Write a protein that binds this ligand. Structure first.
Ligand SMILES: Nc1ncnc2c1ncn2[C@@H]1O[C@H](CSCC[C@H](N)C(=O)O)[C@@H](O)[C@H]1O
Ligand SMILES: [Mg+2]
Ligand SMILES: [Mg+2]
Ligand SMILES: [Mg+2]
Lengths: 239, 453, 315
RNA sequence: GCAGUGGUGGCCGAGUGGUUAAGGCGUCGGACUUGAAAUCCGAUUCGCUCUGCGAGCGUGGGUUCGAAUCCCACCCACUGCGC
């Protein structure tokens, strides 16, 4: 049935290694820059807005919004050293606007690099699906302490019944809505209820949490397919 | 052989399960423990040999660089501070260490392998756990009337039709040699035509195999005991490593040897046709003589390479036994199906079914068909991979290989003779009348008296 | 070599030789066969197994209608018996040796004439039953497979092949042996005329005769894709050369003060299946496949009774 | 059976004593792109204590610090012979 229970333990203990070898084999050429960020969230629109990018990758999510709006300071978090080195070697990088640092969002703590209750917006774009479902609230609590008590957290990631979930063969299933790719990285497909009751258990307040529907079409192969991402915004209670 | 990672417990393995299986087969446990210790030692020896090889490589690279620029806790920078003569002095120590480690590693490899080749395949949970074949062999199905009695046994019937020459055969070939002649050559050919046509209509590819297999290839498809005392050895001019095949399943298994088979077209079905040469012929009474147990005979075999996923090889197993059943039902021969006990399976089989035909003139059940599912035990040895592409991290998967006798001609002739005898001759089965000459399409007449009478 | 008679058109030429045709119909596996068995080993598969079986059926029925008794022989023979039917040249050069357990001395047969000859050794045959005719069916094993160009590769010269033989024990009196010799070569000729294979009959020169033969006729078929005559049938009259070595005696009673007479023995190939398949493929090739000879259609499976289709390109 | 030329990875095909076994072709998966893809990014022999190191160019050996490259044997092909 599911993947061997021994193998799932090897996947959990080698999560950082699997993401590091991904950046080794694929360099910065796999993912593409996300220019839809500023438009999608009512924040990030056009003073000194300090931001934390949890799971920054090689950029692709902060460099666009950072060359767009020129009064944003950014913290960058990633547990893979290769991704950090790629972010630093980017020609668009300057220390006066970015502060990149490695931090395993489940084991390490964010206060060792960012000041408490300082960040006004933190982004979770396709980062939480790579974390084991039983260590996600760890990440939510780790980022709960650096958020300004009126600030918020922005989240887009895979949702239930997306096509990518359906392409996976049965030999790639770790559990309910929990799969693994050929390269070792994993994918959890969230539901609105699961994410809601995962954010509520760590002290957040739901604002918007609803699915976003798209489609993928390759004209040459004439392939058009449905896609289901879950977008949301949670807010830290004022008082 | 089994997958070595089934014994590594640091991987996802479990040698306790191999111990349980080795007990259920009534073989020697503790072979598993010898294997585990030999393998755990071989892994450390391999690590050390790789490290010695790395040091030798690094010495050679440094020497080459020193030369082209016109000049064992060693490091890269450490060697970069030596004259060429000193690095060669170090290379000599590396050589000695490498040689002794290589001897130790070859010994450990041979020992681990001779322990591994004597551990049997995992058992299907349907196998009856026992060691008494006569008592616990489970009868699954019965077809026809398996209690009727008739006058003559095949040992008399082959002579009353004048189709058998035993004494002259033993003069020519020796114990058990025989000439088949007259009406029984036509009947054997009719059986071959009928079986090939049936299997071809089912989708099997008829294939006529070579009868000499080389030793290098026969080792990978045979067992120790068989390869030792059951196979004839052929010798030409020179010397001679060739062995007469004991079944067509052996060359057909080596047909896709060392290949990456596309999953599409994976259920390849082969109807092998060859002459088989078996050296063991023991007589347990009179009704096992004649042409029943002989040294040479033609056999038609089913052979299927299958996908290892989705329980497909077990559905294929049922399909193959069903094909043989329908063959013998169209021939009108009564039989029962028996599930063989754990202690009687060979090492490769996870399960084995046998079709045992009722011999009314002998009053016995005799095995005609033998259908086995050997899973990936042999494909791993022959390196017959299931996909064309190897994945990034996953290990290579192997195909399952099933085989099943369709028709051994001598034994089936004996069954037909015993079941179709009348007082005037042998009635020809309705499905074989197409393939018989005119005049031999209704009856094979008795032309000699019974040797017992 | 004296050519005695022609039949058919022995000058027409066609596109491919058998070496390409056996691959175009997908009935030959030479590389994997050489991996399994070694030089010249081969798997025969698919449509070519059905065609070989059809040839065996047709040959056996043809010979059975003529009064021959089909006989399936042992494939190895004790050395003490093989010496009396073969020569020394054959054992080293052409006979494989079979080894059992305990190190027996058996040899794989090179032709079914060898076991059939030993079927009546040390016997006194009744003159009344003497035209004793047998249609041997067996697998033959030869060591010499030396090649002489591309057109001799494929399944033409192999180590293992099925062969149907004519073997006759005859009276040694009244020129009956030579009448039977003519009858045997005529049976083979009619077999190949009914298949539509053009040939000429050749009288082999005395230099290239084996020791037993007192006369030999070969039937050499025309190969239109190869452009050559190839031997398909060999007919030989050995008179009493082997009968007295095997002590097969003509009368059942011996006269006082009068030496015994031995029978006459004649052998003739009826059909070596690989070579005959090569000849059929080369003579019946079209642009879309091989036409099935009219006489083999009843012995072929449904779907292969008019054409053997090409399914691969020519190498 | 001799007396010549040959044998590279799933396939073709480079390879020049210091490769990363090039380039293709085939196959296989991953895709998060709002500037989505009539495509992009990769993987694709074996082994080990796996971000690396080791082995592997028909198979075995030799020479060399180092061989896929040079030598030998065997095996199997092709070209000429014997048969
Ligand atoms: N538990 C964890 N702690 C910190 N980073 C993690 C993490 N789990 C996964 N990651 C990182 O999250 C990244 C997801 S790839 C997505 C990158 C980014 N969201 C973008 O839009 O480009 C990976 O690079 C991985 O290194
Ligand atoms: Mg190649
Ligand atoms: Mg390449
Ligand atoms: Mg080599």
């Amino acid at each position: 049935t599911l993947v061997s229970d021994f193998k799932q333990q090897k996947l959990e203990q080698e999560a950082q290694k699997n993401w590091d070898l991904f950046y080794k084999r694929n360099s910065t050429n796999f993912f593409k820059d996300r220019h839809w960020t500023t438009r999608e969230f009512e924040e990030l629109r056009s003073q000194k807005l300090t931001m934390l990018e949890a799971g920054c990758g090689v950029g692709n999510c902060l460099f666009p919004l950072l060359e767009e709006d020129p009064n944003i300071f950014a913290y960058a978090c990633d547990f893979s050293p290769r991704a950090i080195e790629y972010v630093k070697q980017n020609p668009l990088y300057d220390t006066e606007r970015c502060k990149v640092f490695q931090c395993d969002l489940t084991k390490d703590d964010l206060l060792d690099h960012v000041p408490p209750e300082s960040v006004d917006v933190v982004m979770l774009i396709f980062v939480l699906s790579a974390v084991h479902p039983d260590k996600m609230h760890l990440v939510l609590q780790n980022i709960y302490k650096v958020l300004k008590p009126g600030k918020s957290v922005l989240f887009r990631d895979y949702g239930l019944y997306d096509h990518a979930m359906l392409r996976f063969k049965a030999s790639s299933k770790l559990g309910e809505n929990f799969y693994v790719r050929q390269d070792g990285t994993r994918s959890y497909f969230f539901t609105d209820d699961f994410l809601a009751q995962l954010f509520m258990d760590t002290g957040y307040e739901e604002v918007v949490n609803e699915y976003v529907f798209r489609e993928t079409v390759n004209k040459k192969e004439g392939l058009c397919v449905p896609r289901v991402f879950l977008q949301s915004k949670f807010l830290k209670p004022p008082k | 052989v089994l997958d070595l990672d089934l014994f590594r417990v640091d991987k996802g393995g479990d040698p306790a399960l191999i111990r349980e299986t080795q007990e259920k087969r009534f073989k020697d446990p503790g072979l598993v423990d010898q294997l585990v210790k030999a393998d755990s030692e071989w892994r450390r020896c391999r690590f050390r040999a790789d490290n010695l090889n790395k040091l030798k490589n690094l010495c050679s690279k440094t020497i080459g660089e020193k030369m082209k620029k016109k000049e064992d806790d060693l490091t890269a920078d450490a060697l970069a501070n030596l004259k060429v003569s000193q690095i060669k002095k170090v290379r000599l120590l590396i050589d000695e260490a490498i040689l002794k480690c290589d001897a130790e590693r070859i010994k450990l490899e041979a020992e681990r392998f001779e322990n591994l080749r004597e551990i049997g395949n995992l058992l299907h949970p349907s196998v009856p756990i026992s060691n008494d074949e006569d008592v616990d062999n489970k009868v699954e199905r019965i077809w026809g009337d398996c209690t009727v009695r008739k006058k003559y046994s095949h040992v008399d019937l082959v002579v009353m039709v004048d189709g058998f020459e035993g004494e002259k055969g033993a003069v020519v070939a020796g114990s058990r040699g025989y000439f088949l002649k007259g009406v029984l050559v036509f009947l054997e050919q009719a059986l071959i035509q009928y079986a090939l046509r049936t299997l071809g209509s089912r989708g099997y590819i008829p294939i006529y195999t070579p009868f000499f297999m080389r030793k290098e290839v026969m080792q990978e498809v045979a067992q120790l005991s068989q390869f030792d005392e059951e196979l004839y050895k052929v010798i030409g001019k020179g010397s001679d490593e060739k062995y007469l095949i004991a079944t067509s399943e052996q060359p057909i298994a080596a047909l896709h040897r060392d290949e990456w088979l596309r999953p599409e077209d994976l259920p390849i079905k082969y109807a092998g046709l060859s002459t088989c040469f078996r050296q063991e012929v023991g007589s347990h009474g009179r009704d096992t003589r004649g042409i029943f147990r002989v040294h040479q005979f033609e056999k038609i075999e089913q052979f299927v390479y299958s996908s290892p996923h989705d329980n497909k090889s077990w559905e294929m197993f049922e399909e193959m036994i069903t094909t043989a059943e329908e063959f013998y039902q169209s021939l009108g021969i009564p039989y029962h199906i028996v599930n063989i006990v754990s202690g009687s399976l060979n090492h490769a089989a996870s399960k084995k079914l046998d079709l045992e035909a009722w011999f009314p003139g002998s009053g016995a059940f005799r095995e005609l068909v033998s259908c086995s599912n050997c899973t990936d035990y042999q494909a791993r040895r022959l390196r017959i991979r299931y996909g064309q592409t190897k994945k990034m991290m996953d290990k290579v998967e192997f195909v399952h290989m099933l085989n099943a006798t369709m028709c051994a001609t001598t034994r089936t002739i004996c069954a037909i003779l015993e079941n179709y005898q009348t007082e005037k001759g042998i009635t020809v089965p309705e499905k074989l009348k197409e393939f018989m000459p005119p005049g031999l399409q209704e009856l094979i007449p008795f032309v000699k008296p019974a040797p017992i009478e | 070599n004296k050519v005695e008679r022609i039949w058919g058109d022995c000058t027409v030429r066609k596109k491919y030789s058998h070496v390409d045709l056996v691959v175009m119909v997908d009935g030959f596996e030479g590389e994997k066969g050489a991996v399994v068995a070694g030089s010249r080993g081969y798997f025969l598969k698919g449509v070519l197994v059905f065609l070989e079986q059809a040839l065996i059926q047709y040959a056996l029925r043809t010979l059975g209608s003529r009064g021959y008794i089909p006989i399936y022989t042992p494939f190895f023979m004790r050395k003490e018996v093989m010496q009396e039917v073969a020569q020394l040249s054959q054992f080293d050069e052409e006979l494989y040796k079979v080894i059992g357990k305990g190190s027996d001395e058996k040899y794989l047969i090179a032709t079914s004439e060898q076991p059939i000859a030993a079927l009546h050794r040390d016997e006194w045959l009744r003159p009344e039953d003497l035209p004793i005719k047998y249609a041997g069916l067996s697998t033959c094993f030869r060591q010499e497979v030396g090649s002489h160009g591309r057109d001799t590769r494929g399944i033409f010269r192999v180590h293992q092949f099925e062969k149907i033989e004519q073997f006759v024990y005859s009276s040694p009196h009244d020129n009956k042996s030579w009448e039977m010799f003519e009858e045997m070569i005529t049976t083979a000729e009619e077999f190949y005329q009914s298949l539509g294979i053009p040939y000429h009959i050749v009288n082999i020169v005395s230099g290239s005769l084996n020791h037993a033969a007192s006369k030999k006729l070969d039937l050499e078929a025309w190969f239109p894709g190869s452009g050559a005559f190839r031997e398909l049938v060999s007919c030989s009259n050995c008179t009493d050369y082997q009968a007295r070595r095997l002590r097969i005696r003509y009368g059942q009673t011996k006269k006082m003060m009068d030496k015994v007479e031995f029978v006459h023995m004649l052998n003739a190939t009826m059909c070596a299946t690989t070579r005959t398949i090569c000849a059929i493929l080369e003579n019946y090739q079209t642009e879309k496949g091989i036409t099935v000879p009219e006489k083999l259609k009843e012995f072929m499976p449904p779907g292969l009774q008019e054409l053997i289709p090409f399914v691969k390109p020519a190498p």
